[PDB]
């Protein structure tokens, strides 16, 4: 897929696309790929897709405890020093490429995790196989200090890019804003640029076209007194 | 009622079975401490029971590391345990920093065990008091450990059946020094306190043993003194207390 | 845990020893006889209540091969779980050995589940009694042994455990030989039930028969079957 | 039943009380003295028959040919440290290519017993053990008590009536050090020194039991009419 | 060693297990908490005590949160219900955010919470805690519901209850002002008022704790956007707007 | 090779409106020897319905798994488990095994009696929920299915026009494939009463 | 110490009978009653609760009724509490036979098992034994229908109507006088409602201090229908016997 | 009874093993006092050398567990040192795992739980110390928390320990009375040790020496100890005043 995540001085943004292949077969036009490690943190993922998102259900938990134990919002680097020393010690054969996200008051963040364990920093990070193609368009627009419009369209803009040149990205663009000190805005189908054409005509047919064989009722509605 | 075990306590605040355990090291052996500039000199009290003994080889000093004396008093096996797991703590320290522990960092770590067995009733307190010390570079350290797990540090220490004898000397001799005093000349000082701690034991005799850790003699390791030296010390203290 | 239930005793006893033979005193009651073809053990069925269906309460006579039984006396909470692992060691014999097992085998493994439980401390053993019966295969002798919660086991001919043995045995001292066994299954059938009929009492309701005769003969009798044998011993 | 029914329990007199039992092990038990010059060590045991149709049972355990350990108190409790002593031994030589030192093997003693009178539900040992042999630094002679404190000796004693002894090893003390390479006259001395501890125990030739080391000489036990040489 | 895995908890000789017995006369040495159901939101209302006029209650958590839509609150020792309230959280999480993934319903995490009460009466080295537990909740499936834990490790559904040494009065006191139909408005009126008959100090709302398992809220999850989702149902109220209340009886 | 593709099978599922239609192969072999023209790969718990995919043992592994799984929340809950948490579990339950992990593709369809929606996801062999409202295909002729079933669909059915689509769909991959064929069975799920219907189809 | 804390209280007592076990009867004696009676067409599960309160909800409370499987459900009396553990260990133990046999345990098998854990807890460990008496309803293929009543010192015994919980002597009594082998469900539902009444610990029975269970062999087919009623049902029943 | 010798409820539902674990910290006769200045929090305690021969550098009461969190304690020395190093393994470990510096709110609630396991088992013995925690969070801002043998916590404003901490109490209690917030108004924190000792001296009726002080200061990222020396200084400034 394409992960891109674009820290500013005022916020982070971070958008990612909504097909899900599997190999070059399309498993889905449509899914979430904007994951919850909490509430305040924000996450998708790229490469297989199973390992992310378990990945992300397990830290979800131990985060959502840290949480409840401080009761006030969750560090994001909580988040990042607990997926590192789980995947290293695996060493990486678990497959995760997450952009991580988020918010808190030591700041805006912005990190990037490999398979193996490693961690980047950036005051901008893409990930996934679309990567590349991202990068190009956002760094010429770049600038340092960008406002939270102007960073939103730059981050759909590199996504498009990716549709336009890698074959993992595709359908819909969403786009989740955090900003400090206030709430996460989940901007879900920001940008939809495909649609399916039209057909030019309904493809319906009378019944028994398909030949049937035999039949019987089944019954889940309950269990039966008399 | 409140004797039976180390997890009762009192309404006084008070656990006896710890503080019993004081009462075993003041019926052992007397034994001193004095901290120097340079560094410290132990000297701890032999009881002769009898004429077959050979003197000099029934130790109660045992070094720890290449440079951390111990000598203790009290119940003698359980000493001997104590210093048993310390010295699995210096290698420990050695293998994982790759330096030799620090004075400071063994007397913190004997803490921890002596607390352990207080808190519960599934093992049985130490009956010792330990006196050790030694130089690192922080500087010349002396500490005495109670059986319920209490060190401070100590210009001058003592326990045993003497250690009244003992630590009313020390404050005359602070009094004399009252900038601290060489490692060197101490040791003619140690045998001097136990003569006068052996008339708590002036019913039976005794053999006088010193150790020393010093840097301006030594080089900052933990060894024994021995002839001409040892010889020395002897004839000094006969002599004062005739 | 270890801190012992079992602790020796100024009498050179056990405690739980002496308690487990205070339960199979007070527990059920059972009389073994066997023989020269057969071996019977009858055992109290407790069903004294009006209104009980006797195929589900408890079993007090359970077969562990297809010619080897367990019998028991004493509590009846205890004995569940020493007839499930002698089942266990029965089938373990026959995977790994080979040949059905013998009666001897048995005797031994539970009188050797009773050892453990003494000797080792927080732990107290079973308070019951067993008949073990039954044969070896290859041969046509009949085999009556009794354990007891001690881990002792003792070859009989005749024997009884459990409420009232007293009054049992000294029957069986005038109408049995210790040398000549019954030479017919119907007669070691009836002396059986004649010994069940003085303590336990009230018809052949909590009377219970197993047979077992060689070729691996397993044969349980309902009450009902009893009752005959009854009104023609009560005639004689 | 406060401190005299556990294990774990002190004693303000700074005690354990179980140790003084186990130490009265030994006044019921048998008795045996050794001594030592600076050439040879020397144990000599009184055995003790069941009974007049029962052989007398051995009181010495070769452990090396370079040790021995003797018991005075309970056999079972004996059987514990005789195991412990010859596995630390053979790991000496296997390990280090060396002998195993007496002092040392002394305190690698010590401290085995100390953790198991720690561990509640435990025993302390309740057999004293001389703990004889020659290494590098010559004859050593250790006294084992059932504390697990180690001593070390020309000549000691323990059982019943060991006290007689020491006082004819006290008198004999400086006779036997300044005898060297000789290790009969040791034995004869020793004979004499468990005679002040008879109580018409009879010392015989299928009683004494008498057990070396030397510099040049195995750990060897002599028995049968061959301790008639020393009688 | 180890030789206490004998259980701490035996019968009397006259019947009834005489530990739990004990455990539940510590809720009647406690403070007075309770709660309040309606059919439209629970409320569950606690008093702070503090053994220091210099101590802080606004540090001080006696009713906290176990899933956004779920909380608690106790009556009785407060170290026991400390530690009690983590093996909550804890069991929850283990089993039903790595397993079933999703806020479990209440009915389902009430049965988990008493297994560990059980488990507690069960071993040796442990006898148990002498807490009770309100539990109030809403999950979608059962609708609402407002349960108590028992120091035996056992649960009841209940319509309004009380917990603490002022529980008999305040169960004859909600008989009369309850009713099959509240408001939730109305039931912060009534516990409040209850619970102001049980406390036997000065009854403030800086010195009050008051939450309901009430209307959502979503700006308290973290984020906005997606309506499908939403945030906590618990939530706590200030201490000012709780002096508002005051005034509301 | 790999285990998943020895004896083959398909799942194939749509939406529709207010309904959800899962249908399966009958077909299980080992190999090229064709085995049984006589099972399903269609369970259900509650009203939820469970197609699974891929190498024998697990499907029948899993089958069971499910079953201790979904009981416990039945006598619980005194009710039907949801097909949105029954996804849930799918996934964890898969997760549990990493070293020698499965080798299927379960499919979950049911329908959400709390606000009327047709619901299905996907699996692979670890987990990915896989989230349509359109449909979720798998087993090893997937690429066939996912073909024909975009063509012939139109978003939202009626129930009757959802049978017609997804047995076209079913019939035409299963003789392309060629471990699946022997006999084919169709479950149209409404949220009242679910019929069974075999279909007719070449004997391959 | 460790055995200074501990005066033993899991051996037997010169009887041969466990402390802990006969003081667990008398306990079960103050919680609330629970009838199971067989009729030759179902198991009718009938309980008392042993709390009733001002302001108790009972009108969902399912704290004695629990199912351990779609065949076997229990009637409780005894410590709610206590009886917690062992319901969910049932559950476990009849989902494992149907997971690796593919058939429905047996209810003498379910009923053995829990027993052994009962056994257990006086055979090792120093632990107390729950202090609970289950009454089972169950159906198998092999003995029908079967019914069990089990005690805290583990051990089963059939029945074909029994009683536990408070005033058992008198409930035992009455069931014996009244009970035909050829009553039904109806009659069944009618006797075990009498029943309960003479051993109200209240001085009247109410249908919200009811719980009222039927399994049923009038579900089609010969299968066996489990119902839990509703409180408006329990009503419903009660005043057609004309309690109330 | 012996409900009273192991922690087991009595039939008043009170563990009278645990409440005998705070009556145990009077017997060394140390008090402490905390306060929360402007940008600081300072904490004042007595420093007992009975003897010469006690070396006065040594006898610390004062134990830094995080970089950021002081620690004094009240009562015997053993426990204290016990304490100390359960939550010095406790700091670090959510450090490794938190990637941050863990908050005193959590230290202190972490310590509670420990204290109740403590009290839960029927062969351990409550660690008896009384523990004040003092920091400067820059979540929280300045804070103390005094955790407790029995395993209850709760936030201050202020606390004193010790055998006659009443008295210092009341001291404390009126001075926030008058201000009318919970934090004492200055701006150098060396004013605020100042005003702190003032408070002690009135309270214990006693002038200290600076060997029968110690003081901690927590400032803004970081805690440390004044040595005697400084602390002579502020004896002199009390003069100044």
Avoid at chain 2, 11 to 17: K, L, T, Y
Avoid at chain 3, 183 to 190: I, L, M, R
Avoid at chain 4, 190 to 202: C, F, K, Y
Avoid at chain 5, 106 to 135: D, H, Y
Wanted: proline residues 3%.
């Amino acid at each position: 897929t394409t992960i891109v995540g674009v820290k500013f001085n005022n916020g982070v943004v971070i958008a990612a696309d909504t097909r899900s292949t599997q190999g070059p077969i399309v498993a889905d036009k449509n899914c979430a790929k904007l994951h919850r490690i909490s509430p305040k943190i924000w996450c998708a993922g790229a490469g297989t897709a199973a390992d992310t998102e378990a990945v992300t259900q397990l830290i979800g938990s131990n985060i959502e405890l840290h949480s409840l134990y401080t009761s006030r919002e969750p560090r994001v680097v909580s988040a990042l020093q607990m997926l590192k020393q789980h995947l290293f010690k695996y060493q990486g054969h678990i497959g995760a490429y997450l952009i991580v996200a988020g918010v808190d008051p030591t700041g805006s963040h912005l990190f990037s995790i490999h398979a193996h364990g490693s961690t980047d920093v950036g005051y901008y990070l893409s990930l996934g196989s679309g990567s590349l193609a991202a990068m190009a368009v956002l760094e010429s627009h770049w600038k340092q200090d960008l406002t939270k419009e102007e960073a939103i369209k730059l981050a759909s803009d590199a996504i498009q890019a990716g549709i336009w040149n890698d074959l993992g990205s595709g359908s819909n663009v969403d786009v989740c804003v955090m900003e400090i000190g206030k709430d996460a805005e989940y901007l879900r189908n920001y940008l939809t640029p495909n649609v399916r054409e039209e057909k030019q005509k309904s493809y319906k047919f009378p019944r028994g076209t398909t030949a049937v064989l035999k039949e019987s009722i089944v019954n889940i509605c309950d269990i039966q007194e008399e | 009622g409140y004797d039976l075990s180390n997890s009762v306590f009192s309404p006084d605040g008070r656990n006896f079975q710890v503080e019993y355990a004081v009462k075993a090291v003041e019926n052992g052996t007397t034994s001193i401490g004095i901290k120097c500039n340079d560094g410290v000199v132990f000297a701890v009290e032999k009881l002769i029971t009898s004429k077959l003994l050979v003197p000099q080889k029934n130790v109660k000093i045992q070094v720890v590391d290449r440079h951390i004396g111990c000598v203790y008093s009290g119940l003698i096996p359980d000493g001997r345990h104590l210093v048993n797991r310390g010295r699995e703590e210096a290698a420990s320290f050695k293998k994982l920093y790759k330096t030799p522990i620090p004075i400071p960092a063994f007397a913190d770590r004997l803490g921890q065990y002596v607390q352990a067995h207080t808190l519960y009733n599934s093992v049985r307190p130490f009956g010792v008091s330990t006196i050790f010390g030694g130089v690192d570079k922080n500087g010349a350290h002396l500490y005495m450990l109670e059986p319920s797990g209490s060190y401070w540090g100590y210009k001058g220490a003592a326990t045993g059946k003497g250690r009244q004898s003992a630590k009313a000397e020390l404050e005359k001799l602070v009094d004399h020094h009252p900038e601290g005093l060489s490692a060197r000349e101490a040791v003619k000082q140690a045998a001097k306190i136990i003569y006068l701690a052996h008339e708590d034991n002036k019913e039976k005799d005794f053999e006088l043993e010193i150790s020393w850790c010093s840097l301006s003699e030594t080089n900052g390791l933990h060894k024994f003194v021995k002839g001409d030296l040892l010889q020395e010390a002897i004839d000094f203290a006969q002599k004062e207390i005739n | 845990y270890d801190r012992a239930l079992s602790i020796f005793s100024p009498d050179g006893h056990i405690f739980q020893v002496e308690y487990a033979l205070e339960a199979v005193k007070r527990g059920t009651c059972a009389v073994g006889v066997k023989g020269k073809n057969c071996v019977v053990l009858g055992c109290e069925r407790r069903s004294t209540l009006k209104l009980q269906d006797t195929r589900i309460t408890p079993s007090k006579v359970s077969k562990i091969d297809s010619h080897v039984v367990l019998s028991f006396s004493g509590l009846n909470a205890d004995s569940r779980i020493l007839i499930e692992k002698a089942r266990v060691e029965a089938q373990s014999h026959r995977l790994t050995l080979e040949d059905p097992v013998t009666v001897e085998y048995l005797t031994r493994y539970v009188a050797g589940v009773q050892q453990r439980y003494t000797q080792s401390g927080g732990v107290r053993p079973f308070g019951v009694s067993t008949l073990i019966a039954g044969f070896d295969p290859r041969d046509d002798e009949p085999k009556l042994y009794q354990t007891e919660p001690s881990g002792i086991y003792s070859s009989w001919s005749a024997q009884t455990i459990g409420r009232n043995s007293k009054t049992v045995r000294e029957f069986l001292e005038k109408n049995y030989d210790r040398k000549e066994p019954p030479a017919t299954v119907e007669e070691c059938v009836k002396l059986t039930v004649r010994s069940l009929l003085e303590v336990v009492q009230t018809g052949a309701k909590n009377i219970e028969i197993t047979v077992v005769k060689p070729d691996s003969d397993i044969v349980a009798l309902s009450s009902e079957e009893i009752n005959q044998y009854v009104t023609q011993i009560e005639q004689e | 039943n406060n401190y005299d029914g556990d294990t774990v329990t002190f004693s303000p007199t700074g005690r354990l009380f179980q140790v003084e039992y186990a130490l009265e092990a030994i006044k019921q038990g048998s008795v045996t003295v050794g001594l030592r010059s600076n050439t040879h060590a020397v144990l000599v045991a009184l055995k003790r028959n069941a009974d007049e149709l029962s052989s007398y049972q051995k009181k010495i355990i070769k452990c090396d040919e370079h040790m021995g350990l003797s018991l005075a108190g309970l056999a079972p409790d004996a059987r514990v440290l005789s195991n412990y002593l010859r596995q630390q031994c053979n790991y000496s030589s296997l390990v280090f290519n060396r002998k195993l030192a007496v002092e040392r093997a002394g305190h690698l003693l010590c401290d085995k017993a100390q953790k198991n009178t720690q561990s509640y539900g435990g025993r302390p040992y309740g057999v004293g053990l001389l703990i004889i042999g020659y290494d590098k630094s010559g004859a050593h002679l250790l006294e084992f008590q059932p504390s697990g404190n180690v001593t070390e000796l020309y000549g000691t004693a323990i059982g019943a009536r060991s006290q007689g002894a020491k006082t004819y090893l006290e008198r004999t003390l400086d006779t036997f050090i300044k005898i060297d390479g000789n290790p009969d006259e040791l034995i004869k001395a020793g004979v004499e020194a468990i005679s002040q501890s008879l109580r018409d125990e009879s010392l015989t030739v299928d009683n004494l039991s008498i057990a070396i080391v030397g510099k040049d000489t195995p750990f060897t036990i002599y028995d049968g009419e061959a301790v008639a040489k020393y009688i | 060693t180890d030789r206490y895995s004998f259980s701490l908890t035996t019968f009397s000789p006259s019947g009834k297990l005489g530990q739990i017995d004990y455990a539940l006369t510590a809720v009647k040495q406690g403070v007075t908490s309770l709660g309040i159901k309606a059919t439209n939101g629970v409320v569950i209302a606690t008093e702070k005590k503090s053994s220091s006029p210099l101590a802080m209650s606004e540090t001080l958590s006696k009713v906290s949160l176990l899933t956004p839509d779920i909380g608690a609150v106790y009556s009785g020792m407060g170290p026991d219900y400390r530690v009690l309230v983590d093996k909550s959280r804890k069991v929850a999480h283990t089993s039903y955010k790595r397993i079933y993934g999703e806020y479990p319903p209440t009915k389902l995490l009430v049965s988990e919470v008493a297994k560990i009460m059980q488990e507690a009466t069960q071993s040796g080295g442990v006898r148990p805690f002498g807490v009770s537990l309100l539990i109030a909740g809403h999950d979608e499936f059962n609708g609402f519901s407002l349960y108590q834990v028992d120091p035996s490790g056992s649960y009841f559904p209940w319509k309004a209850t009380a917990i603490g040494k002022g529980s008999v009065a305040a169960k004859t006191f909600l008989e009369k002002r309850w009713n099959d139909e509240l408001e939730l408005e109305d039931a912060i009126h009534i516990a409040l008022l209850t619970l102001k008959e049980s406390v036997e100090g000065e009854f403030n709302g800086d010195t009050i704790e008051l939450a309901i398992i009430g209307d959502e809220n979503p700006d308290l999850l973290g984020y906005t956007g997606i309506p499908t989702d939403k945030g906590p149902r618990f939530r706590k109220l200030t201490s000012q707007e709780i002096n508002d209340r005051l005034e509301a009886l | 090779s790999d285990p998943s593709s020895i004896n083959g099978g398909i799942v194939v599922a749509m939406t529709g409106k207010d309904c959800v239609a899962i249908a399966c192969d009958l077909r299980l072999g080992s190999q090229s020897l064709g085995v049984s023209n006589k099972f399903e790969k269609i369970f259900h718990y509650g009203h939820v319905f469970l197609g699974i995919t891929g190498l024998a043992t697990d499907v029948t592994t899993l089958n069971e798994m499910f079953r201790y799984k979904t009981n416990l929340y039945k006598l619980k809950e005194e009710r039907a488990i949801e097909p949105e948490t029954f996804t849930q579990l799918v996934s964890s339950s898969l997760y549990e095994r990493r070293f020698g992990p499965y080798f299927v593709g379960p499919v979950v369809a049911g329908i959400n009696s709390k606000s009327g929606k047709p619901f299905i996801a996907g699996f692979d062999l670890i987990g990915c929920i896989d989230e349509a409202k359109d449909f979720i295909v798998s087993g090893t002729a997937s690429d066939q299915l996912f073909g024909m079933c975009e063509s012939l669909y139109e978003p939202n059915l009626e129930p009757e026009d959802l049978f017609e689509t997804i047995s076209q769909a079913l019939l035409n991959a299963a003789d392309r494939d060629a471990l699946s064929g022997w006999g084919a069975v169709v479950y149209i799920i409404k949220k009242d009463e679910v019929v069974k219907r075999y279909l007719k189809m070449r004997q391959d | 110490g460790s055995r200074r804390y501990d005066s033993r209280t899991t051996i037997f007592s010169p009887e041969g009978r466990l402390y802990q076990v006969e003081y667990a009867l008398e306990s079960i004696s103050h919680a609330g009653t629970a009838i199971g009676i067989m009729a030759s067409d179902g198991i009718v599960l009938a309980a008392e609760r042993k709390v009733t309160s001002t302001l108790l909800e009972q009108d969902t409370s399912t704290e004695k009724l629990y199912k351990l499987n779609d065949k076997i459900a229990v009637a409780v009396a005894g410590l709610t509490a206590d009886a917690e553990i062992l319901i969910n260990t049932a559950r476990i133990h009849a989902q494992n036979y149907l997971k690796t046999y593919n058939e429905d345990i047996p209810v003498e098998i379910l009923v053995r098992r829990l027993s052994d854990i009962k056994q257990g807890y006086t055979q090792h460990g120093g632990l107390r034994p729950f202090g609970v008496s289950f009454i089972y309803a169950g159906y198998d293929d092999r003995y029908g229908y079967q019914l069990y009543t089990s005690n805290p010192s583990g051990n089963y015994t059939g029945w074909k109507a029994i009683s536990v919980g408070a005033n058992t002597s008198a409930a035992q009594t009455l069931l014996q006088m009244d009970y035909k082998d050829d009553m039904k469900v109806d009659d069944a539902i009618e006797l075990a409602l009498k029943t309960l009444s003479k051993t109200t610990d209240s001085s009247a029975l109410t249908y919200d201090r009811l719980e009222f269970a039927t399994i049923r062999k009038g579900a089609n087919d010969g299968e066996v229908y489990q119902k839990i009623f509703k409180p408006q049902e329990i009503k419903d029943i009660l005043v057609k016997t004309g309690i109330t | 009874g012996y409900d009273r010798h192991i922690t087991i409820f009595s039939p008043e539902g009170r563990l009278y093993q645990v409440e005998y674990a705070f009556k145990a910290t009077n017997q060394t006769n140390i008090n402490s006092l905390a306060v929360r200045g402007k940008d600081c929090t300072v904490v004042i305690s007595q420093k007992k050398v009975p003897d010469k021969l006690l070396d006065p550098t040594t006898v610390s009461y004062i134990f830094c567990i995080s970089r950021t969190i002081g620690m004094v304690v009240n009562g015997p020395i053993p426990d204290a040192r016990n304490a100390a190093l359960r939550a010095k393994a406790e700091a670090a470990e959510f450090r490794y795992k938190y990637g941050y510096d863990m908050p005193c709110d959590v230290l202190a609630k972490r310590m509670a739980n420990l204290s109740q396991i403590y009290t839960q088992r029927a062969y351990m013995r409550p660690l008896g110390v009384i523990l004040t925690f003092v920091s400067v969070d820059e979540e929280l801002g300045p804070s103390i928390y005094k955790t407790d043998p029995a395993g209850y916590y709760v936030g201050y404003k202020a606390t004193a320990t010790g055998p006659k901490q009443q008295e210092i109490t009341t001291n404390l209690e009126n001075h926030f009375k008058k201000s009318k917030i919970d934090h004492i108004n200055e701006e150098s924190w060396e004013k605020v040790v100042e005003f702190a000792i003032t408070h002690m001296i009135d309270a214990l009726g006693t002038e200290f020496s600076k060997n029968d002080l110690e003081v901690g200061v927590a400032t803004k990222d970081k805690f440390f100890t004044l040595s005697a020396e400084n602390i002579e200084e502020r004896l002199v400034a009390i003069a100044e005043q």
